[PDB]
Structure 1
Amino acid sequence: RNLRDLLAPWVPDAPSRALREMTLDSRVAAAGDLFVAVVGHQADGRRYIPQAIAQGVAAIIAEAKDEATDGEIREMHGVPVIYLSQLNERLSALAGRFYHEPSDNLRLVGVTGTNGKTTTTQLLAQWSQLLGEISAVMGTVGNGLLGKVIPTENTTGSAVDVQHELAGLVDQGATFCAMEVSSHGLVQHRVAALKFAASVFTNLSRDHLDYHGDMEHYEAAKWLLYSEHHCGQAIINADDEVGRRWLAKLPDAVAVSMEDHINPNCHGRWLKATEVNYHDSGATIRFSSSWGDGEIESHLMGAFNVSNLLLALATLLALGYPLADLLKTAARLQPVCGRMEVFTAPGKPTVVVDYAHTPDALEKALQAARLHCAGKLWCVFGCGGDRDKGKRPLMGAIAEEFADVAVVTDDNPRTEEPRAIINDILAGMLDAGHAKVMEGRAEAVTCAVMQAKENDVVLVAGKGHEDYQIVGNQRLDYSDRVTVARLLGVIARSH
């Protein structure tokens, strides 16, 4: 693409220059690329401009703050350097023009909410594909076409990486993409210029207050998706108190409920479960909606997953997919790795690996785990260091109440003292001494799985799909899934 044409809408005087790729990281800016230098939370990208030029980039767009006037054009070692004010907020738009508005060449669905963004986006991608689409996903478990996902460091990529990845998916033939949109991403303008066909809200509970401060600001951040973005059709979980208040602000939204919260007199379009029967790590779901009624045989475990599937269903119906065809393919939907992944082997306890790392998620995971638990329910978990300390006491209280045996261990300690984190969790229990504490996650999982009996169930929560553990500033190789698989000698049957 050409620098001149790229900036025409803001810097009509920009010099002509062919550009290959656009990047915000100098470490991967190759010869002929466009390096974008912004001020971050830890460093100033502009300080890497010398290196980028030494690497042969074709041009540079840099934040103007404290250095130049908006739209100022300079030259360094023959390389054009254009300064723009409030660059972070114009990144998505800039990347969009650069990659020729990718979100217009596939149906893009964004999903936000405290829990379930991954399962919901994966279900949307799977289902849509079974309905004749070539689908892709972007989220915590990775980005790419279904079956060809590349692991990611973030839930929602940078404003430039997102546009670049959508353009890449479009070139590969993708026609549908379900993307996880984090509250962090919304506040930081990561998806500011994307054109969503639909925007789904799963729920809101305690989490990320180390970033947002309090629940009021956390809610305001997610609300940005509906107030400040081209959100398209709104799909809202009406079982959430927050979702109900939001539905009152969005007349054309679709309300989805599992706990009888649909109000046909106030919700224009809706979908609700009328009957749900749980059995072999799956469930039979009877529902009624503005598009018609029906029965769905799901192979996902727990009530939480019934809600995620219902949200995916309402979205596809709202997007015009025929109910008849959605019902015919529902049975082929598959659960996501690291989420209510069930491991079963003869002579051994059933082990469930789940991502639940918030008070609310843990409660729902333990409640679901006990439905198929004839013996005792064990809960092996921990909390992340350098994060919301307030949720620690709440989770300890949840484990102590909903589980028969609570094994408190480490999660991702990062720079905090392992024990210190553990003490905060125990402080929320009515009786700390009743919990089995044991540092060293690998050891803890092993002890629980080995001690638990065949009719018992062990819930290993907090990590899910993660194949690493952060201790200090190092990323160590570790996976709950591999640990469990090796102990039982089998992969997840449910998956």
Structure 2
Amino acid sequence: RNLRDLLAPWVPDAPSRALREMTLDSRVAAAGDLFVAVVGHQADGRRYIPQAIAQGVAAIIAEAKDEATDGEIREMHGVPVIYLSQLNERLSALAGRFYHEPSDNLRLVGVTGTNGKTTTTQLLAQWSQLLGEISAVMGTVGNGLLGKVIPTENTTGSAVDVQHELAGLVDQGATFCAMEVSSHGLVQHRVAALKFAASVFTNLSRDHLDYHGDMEHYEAAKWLLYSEHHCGQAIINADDEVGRRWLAKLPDAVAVSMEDHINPNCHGRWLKATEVNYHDSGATIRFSSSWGDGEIESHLMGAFNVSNLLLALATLLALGYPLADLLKTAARLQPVCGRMEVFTAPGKPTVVVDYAHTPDALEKALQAARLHCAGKLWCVFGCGGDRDKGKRPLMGAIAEEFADVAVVTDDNPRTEEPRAIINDILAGMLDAGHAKVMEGRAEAVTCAVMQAKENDVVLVAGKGHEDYQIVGNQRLDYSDRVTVARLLGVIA
């Protein structure tokens, strides 16, 4: 890594310096590093140029605004300081070049939208890996090779971090990466120089866009951004209103629908579910497409996961993965752990474990579960103690309305009186007397599972993958998934 070669596309006469790492943070900037001094909200990195120099950085690249002209090479204490205009806009490209263009050394698929980003990302990574790739994910659940994702707990990734982490995955042997792209990330030019093989839009609609002008400006803002990016093949959910409008303007984009929103007259590429049977262990999805027709046995639950699966299918088809091989591997696609995760056993009720711990998520989960439920829908849940109490009666009302049997139990009561939490939940119900209350979560889960009929579905909500019950100050070892598996005579 040489400063001269790094800047060759932009600054021809740049000094030759060996460079170690690229950083925006003067605190971590060590000897031999390239320190990049940017201007943002409140913060001006050029402030810390002397500190970085004092810490022995090999070179600096700095926002030219007000202090210099574009491409201006200065020299401070023997260290090159090269100034670039609109440095925030160019940071992705700068870092891309520094890290040897990792997006040109694997197949990068970007996924954007409000809902289904995480799931669609995981399905892309899983499915590609089943077809022989070494797949990776980047997003909110974390970054890493499939099955080895390191959480992004409390770390906002800059344009440099994005390129760095992608290069990390390349180094680890990744040939495919499914990346969640946040609305904020796109606007802040954090993926500006990435060569996306495909861009997947789970939805383009947003709230607070009722005025024609606002909708107009939103669309224009986004369309502008996408015109500046290397998006590759566009795969767009046509069940979204904005999606459809965009599809009408994008003859090379792939239209994906499960609600009959494909318009055959355009002769574009398309994929649509023609019928779905939601059964006790997943969904049988019959589909037609410009690549051919087929039938997939998905082990994911609900209509939203049909959409997500179809988006991943359409994307991989667009990228040239053979339909036959995709069909042959579809049954091996699994849910994101504790996200509408189905557990079935011969002659037992179907049990779904989901993380849903808010009123909207609980409603969505129950609505999804209902589709697969020939008999009665059971809902086993509680609410966390020592947290906001407002959701409690709302979750009670939801359980009462969207389930047939509400089983109210404990869920991390912490230091709060467990029964007090339950009372708050019951308060929200029209007929609290119709709900079952059982304390001991394990006991409540058992109650539902052992009593529920063969054709019933039991939703166990609130924890998903979170393998503990916080009672008092103890993080006691407990798992909904393990409890359910044992009750069904299967393995979690």
Tell me how far apart the structure 2 counterparts of residues 473 and 230 of structure 1 sit (CA, whole Å): 51
Tell me how far apart the structure 2 counterparts of residues 139 and 229 of structure 1 sit (CA, whole Å): 19
Check whether the contact 1:111–1:200 (CA below 8 A) recurs between aligned residues. yes
Check whether the contact 1:156–1:182 (CA below 8 A) recurs between aligned residues. no
- Between structure 1 and structure 2, the one with the greater Rg is 2
Tell me how far apart the structure 2 counterparts of residues 217 and 392 of structure 1 sit (CA, whole Å): 38
Check whether the contact 1:140–1:154 (CA below 8 A) recurs between aligned residues. no
Pair 1:186–1:285, CA change in 2 (3 A): same
Tell me how far apart the structure 1 counterparts of residues 295 and 320 of structure 2 sit (CA, whole Å): 19
Pair 1:131–1:223, CA change in 2 (3 A): same
Tell me how far apart the structure 2 counterparts of residues 204 and 103 of structure 1 sit (CA, whole Å): 24
Q: Single out whichever of 35-44 and 382-391 deviates more from structure 2.
A: 382-391
Cα deviation, residue 85, structure 1: 2.6
Superposition pairs of residues 157-196 of structure 1, within 5 angstroms? 157-196=157-196
Cα deviation, residue 74, structure 1: 3.9
Check whether the contact 2:379–2:399 (CA below 8 A) recurs between aligned residues. yes
Tell me how far apart the structure 1 counterparts of residues 236 and 433 of structure 2 sit (CA, whole Å): 42
Three-state SS of the structure 2 residue aligned to 1:118 is helix
Q: Single out whichever of 296-305 and 217-226 deviates more from structure 2.
A: 217-226
Query: For residues 223-253 of structure 1, what are the alpha-carbon distances to aligned partners after superposition, in whole Å with 9 as ceiling and x for unaligned?
Result: 4563331111111111111110110110111
Tell me how far apart the structure 1 counterparts of residues 423 and 47 of structure 2 sit (CA, whole Å): 42
| Alignment correspondent of 1:297 | 297
Tell me how far apart the structure 2 counterparts of residues 338 and 383 of structure 1 sit (CA, whole Å): 17
Pair 1:248–1:374, CA change in 2 (3 A): closer
Check whether the contact 1:24–1:35 (CA below 8 A) recurs between aligned residues. yes
Pair 1:290–1:404, CA change in 2 (3 A): same
Cα deviation, residue 14, structure 1: 3.0
Cα deviation, residue 80, structure 1: 2.9
Check whether the contact 1:254–1:267 (CA below 8 A) recurs between aligned residues. no
| Alignment correspondent of 1:100 | 100
| Alignment correspondent of 2:227 | 227
Check whether the contact 2:109–2:177 (CA below 8 A) recurs between aligned residues. yes
Pair 1:375–1:325, CA change in 2 (3 A): closer
In the superposition, the TM-score normalised over structure 1's length comes to: 0.76
Check whether the contact 1:209–1:388 (CA below 8 A) recurs between aligned residues. no
Pair 1:400–1:71, CA change in 2 (3 A): farther
Pair 1:407–1:279, CA change in 2 (3 A): closer
Query: For residues 26-61 of structure 1, what are the alpha-carbon distances to aligned partners after superposition, in whole Å with 9 as ceiling and x for unaligned?
Result: 444333221223234464444444554444332222
Tell me how far apart the structure 2 counterparts of residues 268 and 368 of structure 1 sit (CA, whole Å): 31
Tell me how far apart the structure 1 counterparts of residues 243 and 394 of structure 2 sit (CA, whole Å): 23
Check whether the contact 2:125–2:135 (CA below 8 A) recurs between aligned residues. yes
Check whether the contact 2:300–2:341 (CA below 8 A) recurs between aligned residues. no
Pair 1:6–1:206, CA change in 2 (3 A): same
Cα deviation, residue 77, structure 1: 4.5
Cα deviation, residue 127, structure 1: 1.2
Q: Single out whichever of 398-407 and 70-79 deviates more from structure 2.
A: 398-407
Three-state SS of the structure 1 residue aligned to 2:265 is coil
Check whether the contact 1:380–1:448 (CA below 8 A) recurs between aligned residues. yes
Check whether the contact 1:208–1:387 (CA below 8 A) recurs between aligned residues. no
Q: Single out whichever of 13-22 and 57-66 deviates more from structure 2.
A: 57-66
Query: For residues 172-212 of structure 1, what are the alpha-carbon distances to aligned partners after superposition, in whole Å with 9 as ceiling and x for unaligned?
Result: 22211111111111111110011111111112455699999
Tell me how far apart the structure 1 counterparts of residues 449 and 89 of structure 2 sit (CA, whole Å): 49
Three-state SS of the structure 2 residue aligned to 1:352 is strand
Q: Single out whichever of 440-449 and 60-69 deviates more from structure 2.
A: 440-449
Pair 1:75–1:383, CA change in 2 (3 A): farther
Three-state SS of the structure 2 residue aligned to 1:285 is strand
Cα deviation, residue 415, structure 1: 20
Cα deviation, residue 474, structure 1: 18
Query: For residues 291-335 of structure 1, what are the alpha-carbon distances to aligned partners after superposition, in whole Å with 9 as ceiling and x for unaligned?
Result: 111111111111111111111111111111111111111111111
Pair 1:377–1:25, CA change in 2 (3 A): farther
Q: Single out whichever of 139-148 and 470-479 deviates more from structure 2.
A: 470-479
Cα deviation, residue 79, structure 1: 3.2
Check whether the contact 1:206–1:358 (CA below 8 A) recurs between aligned residues. no
Pair 1:13–1:302, CA change in 2 (3 A): same
Q: Single out whichever of 160-169 and 365-374 deviates more from structure 2.
A: 365-374
Cα deviation, residue 9, structure 1: 2.9
Pair 1:48–1:409, CA change in 2 (3 A): farther
Tell me how far apart the structure 1 counterparts of residues 43 and 291 of structure 2 sit (CA, whole Å): 51
Cα deviation, residue 395, structure 1: 9.4
* Pair 1:136-2:121 in alignment: no
Q: Single out whichever of 35-44 and 143-152 deviates more from structure 2.
A: 35-44
In the superposition, the TM-score normalised over structure 2's length comes to: 0.76
Tell me how far apart the structure 1 counterparts of residues 379 and 487 of structure 2 sit (CA, whole Å): 17
Pair 1:340–1:70, CA change in 2 (3 A): same
Pair 1:210–1:59, CA change in 2 (3 A): farther
Cα deviation, residue 103, structure 1: 1.1
Cα deviation, residue 105, structure 1: 1.2
Number of residue-to-residue matches in the alignment: 492
Tell me how far apart the structure 2 counterparts of residues 75 and 40 of structure 1 sit (CA, whole Å): 24
Check whether the contact 2:282–2:372 (CA below 8 A) recurs between aligned residues. no
Three-state SS of the structure 1 residue aligned to 2:211 is helix
Q: Single out whichever of 18-27 and 171-180 deviates more from structure 2.
A: 18-27
Check whether the contact 2:301–2:372 (CA below 8 A) recurs between aligned residues. no
Tell me how far apart the structure 2 counterparts of residues 190 and 337 of structure 1 sit (CA, whole Å): 28
Three-state SS of the structure 2 residue aligned to 1:222 is helix
Tell me how far apart the structure 1 counterparts of residues 401 and 14 of structure 2 sit (CA, whole Å): 64
| Alignment correspondent of 1:50 | 50
Q: Single out whichever of 10-19 and 405-414 deviates more from structure 2.
A: 405-414
Pair 1:345–1:156, CA change in 2 (3 A): farther
Check whether the contact 1:144–1:150 (CA below 8 A) recurs between aligned residues. yes
Pair 1:75–1:8, CA change in 2 (3 A): same
Check whether the contact 2:187–2:225 (CA below 8 A) recurs between aligned residues. no
Query: For residues 96-142 of structure 1, what are the alpha-carbon distances to aligned partners after superposition, in whole Å with 9 as ceiling and x for unaligned?
Result: 11112211111111111111111111111111122222211111222
Tell me how far apart the structure 1 counterparts of residues 207 and 461 of structure 2 sit (CA, whole Å): 16
Tell me how far apart the structure 2 counterparts of residues 47 and 389 of structure 1 sit (CA, whole Å): 45
Pair 1:249–1:127, CA change in 2 (3 A): same
Pair 1:39–1:204, CA change in 2 (3 A): same
Check whether the contact 2:96–2:163 (CA below 8 A) recurs between aligned residues. yes
Superposition pairs of residues 349-388 of structure 1, within 5 angstroms? 352-354=352-354, 363-372=363-372
Check whether the contact 1:135–1:146 (CA below 8 A) recurs between aligned residues. yes
Q: Let me know the Cα RMSD of the aligned residues.
A: 5.8
Three-state SS of the structure 1 residue aligned to 2:412 is coil
Tell me how far apart the structure 1 counterparts of residues 71 and 197 of structure 2 sit (CA, whole Å): 33
Unaligned runs of 5+ in 2: none
Three-state SS of the structure 1 residue aligned to 2:266 is coil
Pair 1:11–1:210, CA change in 2 (3 A): farther
